[PDB]
Amino acid sequence: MKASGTLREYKVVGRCLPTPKCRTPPLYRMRIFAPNHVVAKSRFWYFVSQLKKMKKSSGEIVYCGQVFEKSPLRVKNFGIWLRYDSRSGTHNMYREYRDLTTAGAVTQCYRDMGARHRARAHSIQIMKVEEIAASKCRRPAVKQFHDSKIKFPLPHRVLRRQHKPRFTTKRPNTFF
């Protein structure tokens, strides 16, 4: 996978072709976070090949569709169970993020993995994404945003658009 842009969540269900052995193979459903449906289908085939004895040549994508966010206006806490490959050994972890959308949280997860462990999208295997109550949250970086009377200033505002007035007689102010 190439974690291009913001990811989208896809529900993908697939099955083996009917064979003389069995008329109706069971349908298997999976949640895939992907830039588009093509890579979503590729990832589905990869995961189902690891899990069951299924291959794209001996299977078919029964359905593949984007699943939209149920409540994209409520800020939520997301717990992600994840499996990734390091330079020496592979590790399971659990990370919490804070965002409005499941796809946004997973994209945050990919960027954070790249930033903190140099792990790449082809190394990360995302396992579980769940909405987690603020009481069940356990990472302080997320927990510290759980209060009714949140209040903090913007202390040191760095001047942007530094080049539009490229030569200015003021020395800029950073306190607003």
Partner: protein, 159 residues
Amino acid sequence: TNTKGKRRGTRYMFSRPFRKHGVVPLATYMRIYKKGDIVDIKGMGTVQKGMPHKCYHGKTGRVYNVTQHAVGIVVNKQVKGKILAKRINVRIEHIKHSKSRDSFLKRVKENDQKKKEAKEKGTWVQLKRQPAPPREAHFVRTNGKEPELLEPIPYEFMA
């Protein structure tokens, strides 16, 4: 460099299969080869008379001469940048009828029969073997049971 012996590097090619040594079954001797049959070459080490050279092992040729105990066959050999259709004499043990031709012969008989039939009926029938076409549209019926989730399993070391 290597050695130019006639049987170099044949210890596995000319050997007998496991638990299949001994008397050659007589059905091999009791087969009829005529002029023009397509036939396979498979050297058998049990008999050393009329053994084909190792470079024709696994090759398919055409019979052009039938003799008391052996058969002369024309087979193609790739020599450098050119192919020579050369004729060799092989004793009947190291030979076997090719089944690649009988399928085509049976297909010829069968489509000739279905062409003779329906000729009076005037209907249309397909004879050429079309390649595997793309799958057509259909419906996949769920029987009230929703598809079950599949998730990767956590890593945990075995060794």
